[PDB]
Amino acid sequence: PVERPFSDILTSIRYWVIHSITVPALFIAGWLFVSTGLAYDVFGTPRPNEYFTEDRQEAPLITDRFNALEQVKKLSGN
Amino acid sequence: LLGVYCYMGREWELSFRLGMRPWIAVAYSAPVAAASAVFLVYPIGQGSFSDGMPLGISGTFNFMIVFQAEHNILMHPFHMLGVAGVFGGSLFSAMHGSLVTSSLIRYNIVAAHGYFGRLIFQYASFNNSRSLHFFLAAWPVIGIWFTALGLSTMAFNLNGFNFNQSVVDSQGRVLNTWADIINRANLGMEVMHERNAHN
Amino acid sequence: GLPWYRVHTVVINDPGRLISVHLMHTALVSGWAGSMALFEISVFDPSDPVLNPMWRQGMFVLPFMTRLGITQSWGGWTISGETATNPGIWSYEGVAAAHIILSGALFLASVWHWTYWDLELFRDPRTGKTALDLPKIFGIHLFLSGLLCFGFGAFHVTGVFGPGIWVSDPYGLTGSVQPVAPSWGADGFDPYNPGGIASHHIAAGILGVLAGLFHLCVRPSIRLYFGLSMGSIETVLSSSIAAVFWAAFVVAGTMWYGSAATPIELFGPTRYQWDQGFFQQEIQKRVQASLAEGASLSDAWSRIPEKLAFYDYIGNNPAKGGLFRTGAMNSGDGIAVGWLGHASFKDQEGRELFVRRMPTFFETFPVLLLDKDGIVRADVPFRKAESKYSIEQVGVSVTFYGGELDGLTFTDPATVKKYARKAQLGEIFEFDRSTLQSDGVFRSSPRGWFTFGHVCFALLFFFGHIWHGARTIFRDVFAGID
Amino acid sequence: AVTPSLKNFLGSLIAGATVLGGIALAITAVSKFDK
Amino acid sequence: NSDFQEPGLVTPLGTLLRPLNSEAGKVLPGWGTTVLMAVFILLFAAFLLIILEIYNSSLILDDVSMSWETLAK
Amino acid sequence: VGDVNAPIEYAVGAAILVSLVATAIIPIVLNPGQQAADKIFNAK
Amino acid sequence: MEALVYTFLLVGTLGIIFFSIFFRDPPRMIK
Amino acid sequence: MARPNPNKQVVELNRTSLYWGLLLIFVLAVLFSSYIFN
Amino acid sequence: VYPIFTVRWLAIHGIAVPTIFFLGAITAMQFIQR
Amino acid sequence: EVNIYGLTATALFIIIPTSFLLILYVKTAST
Amino acid sequence: TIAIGTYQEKRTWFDDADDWLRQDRFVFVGWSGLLLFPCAYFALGGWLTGTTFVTSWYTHGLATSYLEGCNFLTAAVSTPANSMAHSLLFVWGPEAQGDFTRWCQLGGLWAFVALHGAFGLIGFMLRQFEIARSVNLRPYNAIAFSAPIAVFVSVFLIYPLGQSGWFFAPSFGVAAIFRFILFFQGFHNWTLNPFHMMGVAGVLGAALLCAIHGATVENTLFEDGDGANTFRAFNPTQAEETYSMVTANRFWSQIFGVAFSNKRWLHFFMLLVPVTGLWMSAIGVVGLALNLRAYDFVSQEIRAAEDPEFETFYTKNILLNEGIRAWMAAQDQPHERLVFPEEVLPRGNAL
Ligand code: CLA
Ligand code: CLA
Ligand code: CLA
Ligand code: CLA
Ligand SMILES: CC(C)=CCC/C(C)=C/CC/C(C)=C/CC/C(C)=C/CC/C(C)=C/CC/C(C)=C/CC/C(C)=C/CC/C(C)=C/CC/C(C)=C/CC1=CC(=O)C(C)=C(C)C1=O
Ligand SMILES: CCCCCCCCCCCCCCCC(=O)OC[C@H](COP(=O)(O)OC[C@@H](O)CO)OC(=O)CCCCCCCCCCCCCCC
Ligand SMILES: CC1=C(/C=C/C(C)=C/C=C/C(C)=C/C=C/C=C(C)/C=C/C=C(C)/C=C/C2=C(C)CCCC2(C)C)C(C)(C)CCC1
Ligand SMILES: CC1=C(/C=C/C(C)=C/C=C/C(C)=C/C=C/C=C(C)/C=C/C=C(C)/C=C/C2=C(C)CCCC2(C)C)C(C)(C)CCC1
Ligand SMILES: CC1=C(C)C(=O)C(CC[C@](C)(O)CCC[C@H](C)CCC[C@H](C)CCCC(C)C)=C(C)C1=O
Ligand SMILES: [Fe+2]
């Protein structure tokens, strides 16, 4: 009930035992997230070779509000 | 220019004649350095006094626009530091005034410190009344020194940053970034400024 | 020794002086309304209601009077261009005189209440000190406001006893004051449907009454009484400031974006109609239908009314203007006098060309004659610049259909260039520029001025709300007491 | 008729109610645990 | 001061309206009726959201058209 | 196309260096603040 | 006419500045 | 004409306030005159 | 001193975990041939 | 005489606040 | 009669909640915390996620992300396309229809960040009020923060609401803000508007006051320490002030001409300057939102058009604005589909 000082945890053994095996897991998770290609699929960012579609050779344009979903699906080539 | 330099000297002279400490001239050096840069060092680097700042308002605006056209000042780190210094000075002035006025009751630093420590965390940062005022005096002065040095360096024409065509996909095509739009604006500005065909 | 900005706080305790002060302010505002009505009526010119409506002459308060039923005038004219025979008591001049008389009576009442400040009505039986029962007073005032709202909704707007309100067709071509039957379905919530107004002024009205009754029969809880400092008279000030803040944004938004309570035929068109090609698209559809039905191009283009062509002109866009470009719109680009007609540009090859209309943002925009495929085919050099495609070279020619210049054609490059630069702004018009000495810079319609002023006031009132609420919550600290 | 947009709006209302209820339950439970 | 500096002026309208300005400071015990206020506030917020989305084209209803064209009913 | 050239060996090598440098300096920066907050607290 | 107005406004500003500099009330509150 | 109001103070304006007000009004006029005249 | 899962724990972890994840992501992005 | 309305606006803005402040100063200085 | 004081009734759930929320811990949650922490956290998270992964290829035709190869200065969270005029861009709204990938592609992340950030500012102001009430101090920090919140509200919500759509609001980034500044310099002549002039004066005066006050206080300290450094010759529990007001007053009354003689007035002036400057700037941008711009100086334009041989810096500024507009609108506004031939582009060679 006193919010133990940071020094106490700094010298603890369980703290280090947990963190030294946990943090590397997060780092590798991020590395695999952006390496396996999941980021492009998840966030819709096109790959370097997908910017210009075969039938389109210029920046896209939405030019539509209530059908923006189909417009974006067509422009992206998916 | 001579008058402002001798004003700088007179500040120290009077400070010494009264028993005060002599470090107000150091603070005043920032605006003096900036004025000296803009009015004397830029023309020397460029080679003519026509490149100085006209003594007016629209003249100052044209001055700024011509820099943004020629040297891309906005992306120079020193101008960023100057903007940061000015904004931080305004912030600190406003907030110091607010806390001091609130504390003064018909305690000056030990009362408002409790408020500040729990408002935005950051306990025991400026608990000494002297360190706080020194920080106030130091931030904007350093910012202005850096921006003046940046203008002086631009006088000898290195440049601001340049990220034009920094992103390219496969096959060699170029994808535009915001820097490219800034560069288009600068290109139009520069083309408009130059007369070239002069009769 | 009160400073200059704490002077009026001397009235913060005695209610009688507060009553007198509020009466004085009410009298001032009523007098302003009357004086502006008289001035605007003195400056108004009712000759031409097509090419010289109210919104071209910088009128501000006249449309508000016209929006609720006031049409005729004592001079014999009407806002619709006809002639009045029986103006009656209720006309523009009558309304102005009534407002002035009200201002004077309120001033006399104000001075009376200022003289007699100590009345028994302002002292409670217990503790013998001045006090106001704020919850019960609020109940009474809310009851009255709700009753008035119901009356207005069910007697004036609906037309069962009153004249009604202004209703017009979508394109602002034929409008007038009519009764408005209520609409209860989901179609009663879109602000472009007039019915949704009347229903509201009924429904909410009833609720108002009910609310007031409650507020007159149930005392507030102790915890709420002390939490909101309901015994003080500055909390109510903060609440009222916040309410007017909110209302200012509501009204400004509805004026800018257009609604059924701000017809385009009284305040002028909005910028979003120019941006989306509303009137242009309507005219094109009508002309195409006329051609399909079978008729000559001149006949098809000679049937559209002049008002519809007037609405499609960028000079009427409220967006384009200046903060310091003072005066009415009629003093910016001259008073309109006629419609030349639709200008069609055709090059030597034979394909028709169209001029790229100027967007709202651009203060100055180059003229670009481009055909139906969207590819530029002619244009004018910036200023004495090298030319590859030019009006002189491509040799485009302009023909006029309908309007005054019906059936004429031009080939001189100077005239073609002039008419292209004129058409880039929209429908070509004729402007008399020698009466008002118009400079040549566009001005904003009443819509923009209203929105700007009320938004600025709303922000300042937000600051006022913050300040007064802070000074109410921190009463003891501010006063330097326990 | 119930258009899909209206269904999505009612779903959003339900989600907001759920979030507010969750926050209220969290504060209540923690306060009861500590007092 | 005595009774806040002696009694004030008395007028027929003042006597008539005195009852409406007598019980100043009276309150109910506990929280009274705050829960009803909370429920009504929530309902009003829902109504405001509905109208805001209707006028912003984020909630398209079958009957409403949301354009100037509705003036030609 | 858009794959990562470097292998996972460097991934783990850098993970070890950038994971045990941030989990041991996050309490050292906050220690002054937590030590002074208690002094400020329970006093006024 | 505009030039005279501008000159008058500038002269007035300078005059107020001078009067504030030289005819200020003494600062005896704290000194 | 009924009874003197106990709540009646008098406004006070020291010289520094007057100088500040004059400076403010003159500076605003200097800034805005050109725009007003166009 | 004994109890855990306090406000401070949640506050620090919430900004700590995503920071490490994004640092790993950016470090991986660095080694892309484009 | 160009922009008579502008000249009147400038004169009023320069006179009314100035007169108000000066009257206030003379009134208070009597204390 | 039955009188009553304060808190003389049975305890309730509200009492327990209030007791827990207003404790003394490393982080002060308070009632305003419930609104501040989630909103601010989500705003920051959204900004970082947008700047790291999401792109603006389908809205502006740009590439702005670390995954696409952008620096800290060029990455940003771009605004939604102009077709989405003023839609709030909910994930469940008619535009996205519940698809997260398409929601990110269309640009609803900007609206997410903006709305949650505005509510975070409101929560922060309420937090300041709560702290001030708890520790019994007058709330001046509330107004000092009311200035920047007003500026943010104006720029990021009222300006787009008057224009075509969200497309013209600032994009959260550095190069985006530079583009915004140049865009106003080109189209509105924002530098000539008096309100920005007043704001500039206010900000520069605030910096000047900060610097001068710091220098004067640090150069007039009393001798209350043997050590060469004056920082350790002080404790928070001091009785008197650490600097001589009389000496500084005389110094600045002999150098400049006018000097302060009241601490409260001095610090209140410090508070007053920047707030007024930023408020005036906010009013100026509010005016600009309706295209009510100070651009004309009609007399100068008429005189210049009458005869070419009359040039002032104002005319040169007008020409520079024309150049900016003509040369930047080509790619700044893709939805307009503008193609200016090189013949028509303004250039100084043709004057
Ligand atoms: C919000 C309320 C409002 C609105 C929207 C309008 C709108 C309008 N009025 Mg009305 N008017 C109003 C209130 C309002 N007025 C009031 C309260 C009065 C009583 C004085 C008048 C008296 C009045 C007259 C007598 C006339 C108008 C006219 C006009 C039209 C011309 C544009 C204009 O106002 O000038 C442009 C506005 C400005 C130049 C003001 C700029 C605003 C800045 C922010 C003020 C800055 C002040 C600054 C701090 C100090 C500067 C000092 C400097 C002068 C030295 C327009 C339709 C004219 C018209 O067309 O009638 C046919 C006209 O002749 N009005
Ligand atoms: C319903 C509206 C309302 C009401 C009844 C009050 C009433 C009051 N206010 Mg509040 N206030 C309001 C709105 C309101 N205010 C708003 C919107 C703001 C934000 C700008 C403020 C900001 C404010 C501050 C900062 C302070 C007050 C103070 C006061 C008190 C003294 C009046 C004063 O300033 O001295 C009289 C003022 C003058 C004689 C100066 C008038 C000169 C003005 C600035 C220019 C001319 C105005 C023009 C002729 C008319 C404009 C009309 C426009 C509103 C449409 C009084 C109880 C003061 C107080 O006692 O609190 C401690 C105080 O310090 N108010
Ligand atoms: C206090 C914290 C807080 C606040 C103020 C907001 C505020 C906001 N969020 Mg955020 N959000 C939060 C927490 C918060 N959120 C959390 C914790 C999450 C994670 C789960 C999210 C996830 C999130 C997403 C993913 C999105 C938002 C969005 C929004 C905006 C739309 C609000 C809306 O319509 O939602 C719903 C609001 C309500 C329903 C209001 C409550 C009214 C209740 C339900 C009344 C109920 C009474 C009664 C039963 C109704 C009767 C009618 C009918 C049922 C018969 C708004 C700015 C959206 C946005 O604008 O992004 C662009 C968006 O896309 N938020
Ligand atoms: C001497 C040069 C100069 C100076 C000093 C100024 C001064 C100013 N200009 Mg600029 N301007 C100039 C020249 C200059 N101008 C020129 C030549 C141009 C070209 C036309 C412009 C174009 C321009 C534009 C387009 C705008 C300005 C604006 C402003 C004002 C900025 C107000 C502010 O701080 O808002 C910035 C502060 C905020 C928005 C508050 C947000 C704070 C949030 C809550 C913090 C978020 C938390 C964060 C994540 C924490 C991280 C902290 C970390 C960074 C350490 C200020 C008065 C702006 C303005 O005020 O307009 C109203 C504006 O929009 N100016
Ligand atoms: C022909 C001619 C004449 C040519 C002139 C042409 C021309 C261009 C004219 C000028 C036009 C002109 C006036 C333009 C400016 C117009 C303009 C933009 C006005 C802005 C006005 C406005 C309302 C802005 C809002 C913001 C605002 C209020 C800003 C205030 C700015 C301001 C006054 C800043 C303070 C400046 C200043 C020097 C302060 C120093 C204070 C000082 C002496 C402190 C010293 C000090 C420190 C201590 O620590 C202690 C302890 C003591 C004791 C002490 O003393
Ligand atoms: C109860 C929610 C629990 C948390 C859910 C997960 C949250 C994280 C979401 C990440 C994005 C993933 C996509 C979700 C989006 C999604 O997949 O929605 C989909 C869902 C249903 O749409 P459908 O896919 O059925 O629509 C398909 C077609 O029929 C559309 O025409 O939409 C809703 O009903 C609303 C859901 C709100 C979900 C957000 C919860 C927060 C609501 C706002 C709270 C405001 C509080 C204000 C307090 C004052
Ligand atoms: C007593 C009486 C009478 C008469 C009366 C009268 C005739 C009155 C009048 C009155 C009037 C005739 C009034 C007026 C008023 C006015 C006003 C009150 C105004 C105001 C204004 C303002 C306030 C403004 C403001 C502004 C401006 C300027 C613009 C914008 C900005 C601002 C907002 C600042 C008789 C014998 C018959 C009978 C018995 C009773
Ligand atoms: C998804 C999403 C969400 C949420 C989110 C979040 C919540 C996020 C967060 C996020 C985060 C939380 C992030 C973070 C990040 C971080 C970072 C990214 C960092 C970085 C750093 C750096 C980069 C550094 C650098 C440096 C230093 C400082 C040291 C040394 C030096 C140098 C300079 C190198 C939701 C569902 C609601 C909705 C939708 C969207
Ligand atoms: C003594 C004691 C303390 C001091 C304590 O912190 C806790 C943990 C409660 C909680 C998990 O923090 C509950 C947090 C939930 C919170 C109510 C959600 C809404 C408010 C914020 C979103 C919380 C995060 C704020 C943080 C980011 C500063 C318990 C159980 C204890 O017994
Ligand atoms: Fe200080």
Which stretch of DSSP H or E encloses residue J25?
helix J4-29
Q: Do the chains contact at H25 and J6, CB–CB below 8 Å?
A: no
**Quick check: K296 and H38 CB within 8 A?**
yes
Contact partners of F by the rule of 3+ C-beta pairs under 8 A?
A, B, I, K
* The 3-state secondary structure of chain K, one letter per residue: CCCCCCCCCCCCHHHHHHHHHCCCCCCCCHHHHHHHHHHHHHHHHHHHHHHHCCCCCCCCCCCCCCCCCCCCCCCEECCCCCCCCCCCCCCCCCCCCCCHHHHHHHCHHHHHHHHHHHHHHHHHHHHHHHHHHHHCCCCCHHHHHHHHHHHHHHHHHHHHHHCCCHHHCCCEEHHHHHHHHHHHHHHCCHHHCHHHHHHHHHHHHHHHHHHHHHHHHHCCECCCCCCCCCCCCCCCCCCCCCECHHHHHHHHHHHCCCCCCCHHHHHHHHHHHHHHHHHHHHHHHHHHHCCEECCCCHHHHHHHHHCCCCCCHHHHHHHHHHHHHHHHHHHHCHHHCCCCCCCCCCCHHHC
Q: Does G30 touch chain K (CB under 8 A)?
A: yes
Q: How far apart are CA K126 and CA K110, in angstroms?
A: 24
CB E34 within 8 A of CB K13: no
C-alpha to C-alpha distances, C70 to C46, C87, C194, K60, nearest whole angstrom = 15, 10, 18, 50
Three-state secondary structure of chain H: CCCCCCCCCCECCCHHHHHHHHHHHHHHHHHHHHHHHC
Q: Which ligand is nearest to the CA of K204?
A: 4
Check: CB of residue B57 under 8 Å from CB of residue B172.
Answer: no
Tokens 């559809």 correspond to what residue?
Answer: C285
Pairing state of beta strands C321-322 and C175-178? unpaired
Residue H34 sits at the chain G interface (C-beta within 8 Å): yes
Distance (Å) from the alpha carbon of B168 to chain I's nearest alpha carbon: 8
Residue K345: count of CB within 10 angstroms of its CB:
18
10 Å Cβ neighbour count for K227? 8
Q: How do C342-346 and C352-355 pair as beta strands?
A: antiparallel
Q: Which amino acid belongs to residue B62?
A: N
CA dist C180 and C197 (Å) reads 9
> Which chain J residue's Cα is nearest to H9?
J28
Chain B residues in contact with A59 by the CB 8 A cut-off are 176
Domain around A78? 3-78
Ligand number nearest to the C-alpha of K35:
3
The CA-atom distances, in angstroms, between F12 and each of F3, F8, F23, I17, K339 are 18, 6, 16, 17, 52
**Distance, CA of G20 to chain centre:** 6
C-alpha span between G23 and G1 (Å, rounded): 32
Residue among K316, K331, K347 minimizing CB distance to B191:
K347
B196 class by beta-carbon count within 10 Å (0-12 exposed, 13-18 middle, 19+ buried): exposed
What is the CB neighbour count within 10 angstroms for residue K41?
15
DSSP state of C71: -
Measured in angstroms, how far is the CA atom of residue K212 from the centroid of ligand 9?
Answer: 44
With CA atoms as reference, the chain H residue closest to E10 would be H2
Cβ of residue D33 lying under 6 Å from some atom of ligand 9? yes
Number of H helices, E strands in chain D: 1, 0
C-alpha pair distances (Å), K117 with each of B49, C126, I29, K35, K157: 48, 51, 29, 11, 12
Chain C contact for K148 (CB, 8 A cutoff) = no
Are C463 and C76 within 8 A, CB to CB? no
Please tell me which of the candidates K25, K45, K69 has its beta carbon nearest to residue I18.
K45
The span from the CA of B23 to the CA of A44, in Å, is 58
Largest CA distance in chain D: 50
**Chains B and E lie in contact, requiring 3 or more CB pairs less than 8 Å apart:** no
Pocket-testing residue among K32, K34, K36, K39, ligand 3, by greatest number of atoms within 8 A of Cβ: K39
Is residue B70 within 8 Å of residue B183, measured between CB atoms?
Answer: no
* K34 within ligand 9 shell (Cβ under 6 A): yes
Cα(C211)–Cα(C135) distance, integer angstroms: 12
DSSP string of E15-45, one letter each residue:
HHHGGGGS--S--BSTTTTHHHHHHHHHHHH
Nearest CA in chain K to A43: K101
**Within its chain, how far is the Cα of C228 from the centroid?**
37
Among protein residues, the one whose CA lies closest to atom 39 of ligand 5: K209
Instruction: Tell me if K38 CB under 6 Å of ligand 8.
Output: no
In chain D, the residue whose alpha carbon lies closest to the alpha carbon of K98 is D8
Mutate to test the pocket of ligand 3, among K34, K44, K47, K90 (most ligand atoms within 8 A of CB): K90
Contact residues, I window 1-34, toward B, CB-based 8 Å cutoff: 34
Both tokens of K243, joined, read 């600097």
- Taking the CA of residue B39 and the nearest CA in chain F, the distance in Å comes to 45
Dig out the tokens for K36 from the structure: 């501040």
Break positions in chain F: residue before each gap, C to N over 2.5 angstroms: none
Using CA of residue A52, residue A54, residue A58, residue A59, what is the dihedral sign? negative
K128 labeled binding residue: yes
Task: Tell me how close the Cα of K251 comes to any Cα of chain G, in angstroms.
Answer: 12
Nearest chain H residue to G25 by CA: give it. Answer: H15
Domain ranges of chain K: 4-351
Looking at ligand 8, which atom is closest to the CA of residue K41? Answer: 7
Amino acid at F41: F
> Coil, strand or helix: which one is C385?
coil
Of B113, B114, B121, the CB nearest to F33: B121
Specify the CATH number for the domain of residue A40.
Answer: 1.20.5.860
Count CB atoms within 10 A of the CB of residue I15: 12
Residue nearest to atom 57 of ligand 3 (CA): K115
Identify how the structure was determined: cryo-EM
How many residues appear in chain K?
A: 351
Is residue K328 lining ligand 5, measured as CB closer than 6 Å? Answer: no
Residues 163-182 of chain B with CB under 8 A from chain K are: 163, 166-167, 175-182
Is E30 in Cβ contact with K9 (below 8 Å)? yes
SS3 C437: coil
Residue of E nearest to H1 (CA): E9
Bridge partners of C370, per DSSP, are C354, C376
K265 in contact with chain B, both atoms CB, cutoff 8 A: no
Comparing alpha-carbon positions, the chain E residue that sits nearest to H6 is: E5
Give the SS3 label for residue B68.
Answer: helix
Name chain G contacts of H12, Cβ cutoff 8 Å.
none
Please, which residues bridge with residue C321 across strands? K292
* 8 A C-beta contact, residue C129 and residue E4: yes
Do the beta carbons of residue C321 and residue C444 sit within 8 Å? yes
Please state, as a whole number, how many other Cβ atoms lie within 10 Å of the Cβ of residue G29. 11
The contacts of residue C232 (CB under 8 Å, 6+ apart) are C472, C475
Residue (of C396, C400, C278, C285) closest to C339 by Cα position: C400
Pocket mutation for ligand 7, best pick of C26, C28, C450 (most atoms within 8 Å of C-beta) = C28
Question: Does K188 show up as a binding residue in the annotation?
Answer: no
* Distance from C-alpha of K8 to C-alpha of C373, rounded to nearest angstrom: 81
On whether the CB atoms of residues K351 and K319 are closer than 8 A, the answer is yes
Is the separation of the CB atoms in K152 and K118 below 8 Å?
A: yes
Which of residues 37 through 66 in chain A touch F, CB cutoff 8 A?
A: 37, 40, 47-49
Q: Using CA of residue K326, residue K328, residue K330, residue K336, what is the dihedral sign?
A: negative
Instruction: Report CA(C471)–ligand 2 centroid distance (Å).
Output: 13
The answer to whether residues C362 and C320 touch, using CB atoms and an 8 Å cutoff, is no
Tokens of residue K11, six digits: 């305890």
Cα separation, J11 vs J7, in Å, equals: 6
Q: For residue C448, what is the enclosing H or E element?
A: helix C446-473
| Residues tagged in the binding site annotation of B for [CaMn4O5] cluster | 51, 70, 193-194
Q: Using N-to-C axis directions, what is the helix angle for K313-332 and K174-187, rounded to 10°?
A: 130
- Distance (Å) from the C-alpha of residue I22 to the closest C-alpha of chain K? 8
Q: How is residue K96 written in tokens?
A: 């996205």
Structure tokens at A66: 């209530």
The alpha carbon of B173 is separated from its chain's Cα centroid by a whole number of angstroms, namely: 38
Dihedral angle at the C-alpha atoms of E26, E32, E37, E39, nearest 10 degrees? Answer: -170
Per the CB < 8 A criterion, the answer to whether K107 and K79 are in contact is yes
What is the DSSP secondary-structure string of C10-44?
Answer: GGSS-HHHHHHHHHHHHHHHHHHHHHHHHHHHHH-
Closest CB from K246, K250, K258 relative to G24: K258
Q: Which residues contact C136 (CB under 8 A, 6 or more apart)?
A: C215, C216, E20, E21, E23
Q: Check if B175 contacts A (Cβ < 8 Å).
A: yes
D2 CB within 8 Å of a chain E CB: no
Q: Do C470 and K129 make contact, defined as CB atoms within 8 angstroms?
A: yes
* Cα-to-centroid distance, D10 and ligand 6 (Å): 10
Any residues with CB less than 8 A from the CB of K321 and at least 6 apart, and which?
C363, K185, K186, K187, K189
Q: Which long-range contacts (CB under 8 A, 24 or more apart) does K8-14 make?
A: K9/C222, K9/C223, K9/E29, K9/E30, K10/E30, K12/E31, K13/D28
Both tokens of C398, joined, read 């302009």
The residues near K266 (Cβ < 8 Å, ≥ 6 apart) are K213, K260
**Nearest chain C CA: its distance from H22 CA (Å):** 14
- Is-contact K315 K300, C-beta < 8 A? yes
Please judge whether H25 and J31 are an interchain contact, meaning their C-beta atoms are less than 8 angstroms apart.
no
Do the chains contact at E60 and K94, CB–CB below 8 Å?
A: yes
What is the number of other CB atoms lying within 10 angstroms of the CB of residue C377?
18
- Cα(K297)–Cα(K277) distance, rounded to whole angstroms? 24
Q: What is the number of structural domains in chain A? A: 1
Ordered structural domains, chain E, with CATH: 6-58 (1.20.5.880)
Q: How far is the CA of B162 from the centre of ligand 1 (A)?
A: 48
Alpha-carbon gap, residue K276 to K270, rounded angstroms:
11
